[PDB]
Amino acid sequence: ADQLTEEQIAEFKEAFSLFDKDGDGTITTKELGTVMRSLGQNPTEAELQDMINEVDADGNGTIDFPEFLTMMARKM
Numbered sequence: 863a864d865q866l867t868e869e870q871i872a873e874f875k876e877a878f879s880l881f882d883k884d885g886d887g888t889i890t891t892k893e894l895g896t897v898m899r900s901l902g903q904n905p906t907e908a909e910l911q912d913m914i915n916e917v918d919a920d921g922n923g924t925i926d927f928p929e930f931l932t933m934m935a936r937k938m
């Protein structure tokens with residue numbers, strides 16, 4: 863288990879699906895709203911822009927699964 867057991871990791875994969883509902887391979891900022899919100903939270907518009915950028919490794923302005931996982935490492 864790197865991050866966590868295959869369970870938690872697997873769920874992170876599922877969470878990814880929940881994020882990228884379109885399956886475009888790209889979590890958008892607006893989608894981030896949905897994302898954080900879906901986990902049962904309430905982000906501000908700023909939080910969408912900022913939450914992405916804070917965990918954007920490429921500086922592109924989008925989040926993928928790999929980046930999500932690194933973010934997940936921060937989630938602790």
Ligand SMILES: [Ca+2]
Binds near residue numbers: 887889
């Ligand atoms: Ca998307």
Ligand SMILES: [Ca+2]
Binds near residue numbers: 918919921924926
């Ligand atoms: Ca990115």
